[model samples]
Target: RSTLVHWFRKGLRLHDNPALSHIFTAANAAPGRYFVRPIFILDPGILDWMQVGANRWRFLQQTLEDLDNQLRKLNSRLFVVRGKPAEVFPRIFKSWRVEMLTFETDIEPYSVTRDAAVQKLAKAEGVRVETHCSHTIYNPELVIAKNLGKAPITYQKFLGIVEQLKVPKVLGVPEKLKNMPTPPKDEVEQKDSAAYDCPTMKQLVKRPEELGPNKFPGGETEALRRMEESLKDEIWVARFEKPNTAPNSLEPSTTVLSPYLKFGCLSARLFNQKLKEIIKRQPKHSQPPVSLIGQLMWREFYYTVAAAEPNFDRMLGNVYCMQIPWQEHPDHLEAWTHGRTGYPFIDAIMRQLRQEGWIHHLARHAVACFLTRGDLWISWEEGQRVFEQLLLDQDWALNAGNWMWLSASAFFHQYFRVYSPVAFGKKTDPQGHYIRKYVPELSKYPAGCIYEPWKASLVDQRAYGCVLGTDYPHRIVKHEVVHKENIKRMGAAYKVNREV
Candidate 1:
C-alpha cells in the first residue's frame, strides 16, 4: 500500500469524488500496507469572510459536518488545522513522512495561487502534489467559440460551443482503502479539531421563513435526488430563463441547485451529464434541459475567464468601466442596503433578502440596477457586501461576475442600459403577487396599484389603507430625475431625453 495524503477543499462528496478515489486506489495498490489520510487546512483569509454572518457561514459549517459524517462511514475522519497551507503541509509531512498528496483542483484565481505555494513546499519535502480536474463538466480551455483563441463575447456563441463539446461520462466510485498506518497522535488531534458545530437550517438562515419546512437536504444524497427530480418534471426547468427574472412566473421555476453547486455537493459534470441524457431520451423536445445546462456552463465559463484574465476582480473584465465616476455617497448606499430605498420593487426585494436570505434572480437584477445603474453613484462592491451578508448561495465568482454584469461594467449587457424597478414590476409581475408576498405594507392596495402606489392621490392612498411616505417607503431616487442625472454623467443619448 501507498501512504498518500488527501486534502479536501470545495469537493465534499464521497459518491463521485475523483480525487479521493485516485488516492484510495493508489493506497490500496501499493505492495506494503499503508494509510490514506484526509486533511482540511483552514487558512484565516478564507475563514475571515466565512465569519461574516450566520446565513452563509452556517451553511458552510453544515457542509463540513456532512463531510465528516461521510468520512466516518469509511472508518476515517477529516483533519482540520488553522494555519497557512505552507505551514500546515510541512508539519504534516515532517510527522507522517508521506511521499505524496492528492486533491481535486479548484479553478478559482485564489486557489490557483495558494496551490502553487503548496506545490513548492511539497517539492522541498520530496513529495509529489497531484491535482485532478473534477469540478466542472467540461474543462474551460476545451470549450471555446468557433472564432477560436478564446470564448465568444456573446452568450449564443458560448452556448453553441457548449453543445458541440463531447462531455465525458461520469466515473464510478473507487473501492475502499485498507491496511492503513495508524494516524499519528497529532494528526488524529488535528483531524478531530476539524469536527465543527453546524447549525440547523433554521438557525443558519436566522429566519424561519427563509427555507421551507421541508427544505432540501445539503449533501450528496439530496443533491442527486434534486437532479433526478428536476429531470422527472421538465416543465419548470424548461422555462427557467424565459420567466427567470419575474417574481411569480411559474413559482419554484428555477432549479434551486445553487447551494448544492456552491459547495461541490453536486458536480457540474454530473448535472450536465444528466441533462445530456435527458436530451438524448427526449430529443424532439429538449431545449429546456439544454438551455439550463448551458446556464450551468456559464458559471464555469466565467471562472475560466477570470483565470485567463488579470485583475478581473477590481476591474471586473473591463478596464474602461473603472474610469466612470460613482456616487460614493454612504447614505444612498445605506438606504439600498437596509431596504429603505423607497422604490417598491427594490425595497421589496431588499427586504426579502434581509428577512428571507434569498431573492429571485429577477429581483436581484432590478435591485442591482436600482442601486448601481439608477444612482450612478454607488459601486457594485457596496451592493456585493449586503448580498454577501445575507445570501445562502453567495459564491464569490458568480456573485462578482453577475454583479459586474448588472453594473453594465462587463460590457456583457453593453454600456448604460439600466433597469427600472417600476417598469420591471409593472411589465412582468403585473398582478404584483410577488410584491404583496414580500412587501406587506402594500397588501391593502389593489394588485395593479401596488407597484406604483405613489401615483395614487392622498384620498386614494387613504382608501387603500396605505400612506405613501409613512406606511411604505417613498421613492428613494426619483425615477425620471435620477435617469437624466445618470445619462448626463454617462454622457449618453443624443436628444429626446425629455420624457425619457
Candidate 2:
C-alpha cells in the first residue's frame, strides 16, 4: 500500500492547507490501497529557541488539541513526536513505511535551514517530498523574483511586485479520509511512540494571569468565527484603514487576526479573498499599504526580506543595516522590560505586552522606538528578543524587520523621527486612560499630571494617592537630553556608514 505523511508546521488549519489537502486527496484516491498519517514533531531546539512564554505555550497547546479534535472527526488524528525533526523523521518514516513526505513551505531563516536537512533525510530514505506555499498570500521567493532578485525595502515597492501576481485560491479541508493509518501493530513500536505526547503549558511554566479583559482564544474554529464576525460589518470592512484606527481605543479598532495568522490557524490567502470580496460590494474602499490588504502585504514583505537576507534578525553582521554603536544599558533595559521605565505611555505598553501576549501595532512601534533610537539608545535586537519572549503573534522576520525599521537601522532611515513617550499617546488619549488602565498606580492622578506623575507637587501626589517615589517611580532619564544625544549619535553613525 502507498503510505503518505504530512508534517504540521506553521500551517496548522485544515481549511486552505495546500499540502495537507494534496496529501489527503492522494491518499483518498486509492481507498484501502493507501495509508495517510499527519504528524507534528515537537522539536526541542525550536521550543528552546523561541523561549515560548506560558501564554504562547497554552495557545499552541490548545491549537494542537483543536487540530486533533478536527482530525478525529475524519477517522484520523495528529501523531505527536518529540526530538529534533532531522533525528525523528527518519525513524518515523522507516517505522510507518512512509513513501511520501509532504509539508507547507516556510521562508523563515531557521525553517529554510531545517527543511534542507529534513529533505536530505527523506531523500536518503527514498521518500518523495512535496511542499507548497500557503502560509503567506504570496510566496516569498516569488515576490523576490518579481523584484528582480532584490528584496523590496518598502511596502509600496512590495505592493508593486504583488500587483503583478495573483494570490492562490483557497482550498477546503477534506471531509473524510479513505484509510486511517493505524498505530504500529508491535507493542515495542507503540510504546516508543507513546513516550511523546502533545505538550502542555504545565511543561513550560505557570499559566500567565489574565492581563486584560480582551479574550483572544486560539483554534481554527475561533479564527474562522472571528473572521466571519469581522466581515459581517460590511461598512466597517470597506472603510477600514490602519492609520485611522485608534491605537488607544478601549476595544481593538483593527481586526485582531494577527495571532491566528502567525500560528497559521487562519490562511492569509483566505483572509485576502474575504477582504477583496467585501470591497467589491462597496462604492469606496481603501487601497494597499494602508488598507487591510496593506497589513497582509507588510507581513509578506518581511517574510520575503528575511528569506533573502541572512542576518535579518540581528543588528550586528546585518549587511543591509547601517552600523551603529548601541549602548549596553542593562539597568535601563531591565526597567523597560518590567514596565517601570517611569514613562507612563511606554510603561503601560510593556505591561500590556507582558500580561496579554499581544498589543496594537502602533503600541509596538512606540515601545520599540523608546527602547532603541528614542530614549534608551539600546539595540533593537534586545527589543526583538523581548518581543519574541512575550508576543503570541511573534514571527522571526516581522519582529526583526519592524525593530530595525523603528531603530532606523534598516528599511527606514528617519532617525530623527521618534515617538514621544508623552506627546504621542496624549494625541489619541489625552487623559492617559490606557496608561491608567495598565499602570494602575497612576490611575488616580489628575489628567494634567498623569503622563508625568513626577511633575505633580507633593500635595497633589498625596491627594492623588500616588507619591512619586512610593507609589510610582520618578522619570528615569531627562527626555530632551537623551533625545538630542540619540539624534547626534544616529547622525554620526550614518555619516560613518556613508564614508565607509
Candidate 3:
C-alpha cells in the first residue's frame, strides 16, 4: 500500500486548500493499496523555544479541535503525530508506507529552514514533497523574483509587482476525496487516534497560569463566519477607510480577523477574492482604504521583504532597520508589558491584550509608539517579544514590520509624528470608557481628569474613590515633558542612518 500524506502545518482550513483537494497520482485515490493520511504535526518543545504564552496556546488548541470538527464533516479525521519532524517522519513513513507528502508553504526564515530539513528526510525516504502557498495570495518568492531579486520595501512597489501578476483564484474543499480510504483501524491506528489527538492546553502549557477570555475562538469555520458577515455589509466593506477606524471603541471598529489571518485558518487569497467581489459591484465605492490601504498587499510586502532580508526580527543585522541607540529600562518595559504604565490609554490597551489576546489596530500604534519613539525610547525589540508572546495573531513578518514601522526603525520614517497617549484616545472616546473598562480604578473619575488621574485633586480623587499612587500607579512619564526629547532623539538616529 502506498500512503499519501497531506500534512497540516499552516493553513488550517479544508476549503481553499489547493494541496489537499488537488490530489496527485491515480493511486492516491484508489482502493486497498492506496490510503490518504491527513495529519497535524504535534511538534512541540519548540513552543518552549518560541517562548509563547498561555493565551495563544489556548487559542491553538481551540483551533485544532475546530479543525478536527471540520475534517469529520467531510467524512475524515486529522491524524496528529507527536515528536519532532526529523524524529517522526521516518517512523511514520515506514509504518504507513508513505509515498507523498504535501504541506502549505511557510516563508518565514525559521519555517524555511525547518521545512528544508524535513524535505531532506522526505527525499531520503522516497516521500514525494509538495508545498503550496496559502498564507499569501501570491507566492512571495515569485513576487520577489519579478522585482529583480530583491524584496519591495514600499507598499506601492510591492503592489506594482503583484498588479502585474494575477492573484490565484480560490480553491475549495476536497469533497471529491470525502469518502477516500484511510489506513486500517489496526492496533497502530486506534492508539494513534487516542494518543496524539489534537491536544489539550495543559499538555502544551503544562503549568499555564489562568488564560484570557476566549473572545475569539480559532478555526476555519469562525474565520469564514466573520468574513461572510462582513460581506453581507456591502456598504461597510466598500466605503471602509482603514485610517478612520476608532482605536478605543468598546467594540473593535474593524473586523478583528488578524488572528484568523495570522493562523492561516483564513486564506488571504479568499479574503482578497471577496474584496475584489465588493469592488467589482461598486467601481466608485471608495479608494482611500481598499486600494490605498491594501491589507493583503501590506502582508505580502512584509513577507516578501522578510524572506529576502536577513535577521528580519532583530535590530542587530536587520538591513532595513535604523540603528537607534534605544535605552534599557527593565522597570518601564516590565510595567508596559504588565499594563501598569499608569497612562490609562496605554495601560488599558496592554491590559486588554493580556485579557483578550487582541486589541484594535490603532491601539497597537499607541503602545508601540510609546515604547519606542513616542515616550520610553526603549528598543522596539523589547516590544516585539511582548507582542510576539501575548497577541493571538502573532505573524512573525507582520510583527517585525509593524514594530519597525511604529518605532520608526524601518518602512515608516515619520518619527516626528508621535501618537499622544492622552489626546489621541480622547478624540474618539473622551469619557475614557475604554480606559475605565480595562483600568477599572479610573472608572469612577470625572471626564476632565479620567485620562491623567495624577492631575486629579485629592478631594476629587477621594470623591472618585480611587486616589492615584494608591489605587492606580502614577503616570510613568509625562507625555508633554517626555515626547519632544524622544522626537529629537529619533531625528539624531535618522541622521546617523543617512551618514552611513
- Model 1's lDDT to the true fold? 0.68
Measured against the true structure, the TM-scores of the candidates, in listed sequence, are 0.85, 0.96, 0.96
Q: Which of 1 and 2 is ahead in lDDT?
A: 2
Model 1 — TM-score against the truth?
0.85
Candidate 2 residue pairs that clash: none
Which lDDT tens digits does candidate 1 get at residues 1-500? 33578888777677667788777787777835556677766576665543244555555656766776777676666666566786777877877778789888876667888898888888988998888777776666666433476755555666677667776667765575565555656654666642322334553355444443235456766777778887786644443453444554425556777777877878777787776666566554435324776677678666656545545555544532344456588877888887777777778788777765567777788888777766645777777777877776677667777777777666454445667777877776777777777777787778656878887889989887778887887776787788668766655422322223
lDDT of each: 0.68, 0.84, 0.83
lDDT of 3 by residue, 1-500 (tens): 67777888788888888787754333334645667777888777467546577888887888898888887776567777787887888888888888888888887776888899989999998788888887888788898889888888888788888889876868877763434665666446676657657787777665466486778888898999988987787878887877788999999888888888898888888888888788888766666224423766778888889988759998988989999999999999998999999899999999999888888889999999999999998998899999988899888899899999999899898777989888889999989999989999888998897888888889989899897888888888888878999988888988988999
lDDT of 2 by residue, 85-193 (tens): 8778877777778888889998876798899999988899899999999999888888898888888888888888888997698898876875556745433346675
Worst 10 residues of 3 by lDDT: 23-32
Ranking by lDDT: 2, 3, 1
Question: For all candidates, what are the clash counts?
Answer: 4, 0, 0
